[PDB]
């Protein structure tokens, strides 16, 4: 049973069983059916790949930290193996975004969501890349986040959680990847202040969603300043 609805049901079962590689492979199959994803389906795709790449990123940081603290060939070789696997997962997500998810039609929410995801997966590639390849990947991540920022400022209110989450991640990109802390701090401050001005005009459910991301923006500002 591998019709589109069966693949989504299997992704939900894999999520309950904490089998994120299975969940990501089921969501990849569902995306390749060619139909748009609902908000619930987008979240399933995002959670699945975030867990997969999150485990590889965590392993890479443990290895990189051992490799640096020691300053044998084993740590380097094993770190390269984890890197190659992480790169394969990012290339798969970037491939899905290019061939199926990123399009001209659809609401601003879906367009910003996928463009933000494109910036995020290029940012994960940038974390492990070196030399000229790293420079090109950094410029590719910036272009995707910038295109998403332009849409969100024109078509979404400043309290929209997708708009807030994009600014949070683009601010992290500026700070850690692009080495532009001034741009990182000013983007997080501006995003926080513009949302703060409109928070009183939201319902309890929306207020809860916006303030949760606003706390993360504040937490990063407290850490960096």
């Amino acid at each position: 049973h591998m019709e589109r609805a069966s693949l989504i049901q299997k992704a939900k079962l894999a999520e309950q069983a904490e089998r994120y590689e299975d969940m990501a492979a089921f969501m990849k199959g569902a995306v390749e059916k060619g139909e748009e994803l609902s908000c619930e389906e987008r979240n399933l795709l995002s959670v699945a790949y975030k867990n997969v790449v999150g485990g590889q990123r965590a392993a890479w940081r443990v290895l990189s930290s051992i490799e640096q603290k020691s300053n044998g060939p084993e740590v380097r070789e094993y770190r390269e193996k984890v890197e190659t696997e992480l790169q394969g997962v990012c290339d798969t997500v970037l491939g899905l975004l290019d061939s199926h998810l990123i399009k001209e039609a659809g609401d601003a929410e879906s367009r910003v969501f996928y463009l933000k995801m494109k910036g995020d997966y290029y940012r994960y590639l940038a974390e492990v890349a070196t030399g000229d390849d790293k420079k090109r990947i950094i410029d590719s991540a910036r272009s995707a986040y910038q295109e998403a920022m332009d849409i969100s400022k024109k078509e979404m209110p400043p309290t929209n959680p997708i708009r807030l989450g994009l600014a949070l991640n683009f601010s992290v990109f500026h700070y850690e990847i692009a080495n532009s802390p001034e741009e990182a701090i000013s983007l997080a401050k501006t995003t926080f202040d513009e949302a703060m001005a409109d928070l009183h005009t939201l319902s309890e459910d929306s207020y809860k969603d916006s303030t949760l991301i606003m706390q993360l923006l504040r937490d990063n500002l407290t850490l960096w300043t």
Binding site: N43, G165, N169, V172, L216, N220, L223, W224
Partner: peptide, 8 residues
């Protein structure tokens, strides 16, 4: 104590 990116 560690920077935040979106939980999704």
């Amino acid at each position: 104590s560690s920077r935040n990116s979106t939980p999704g």
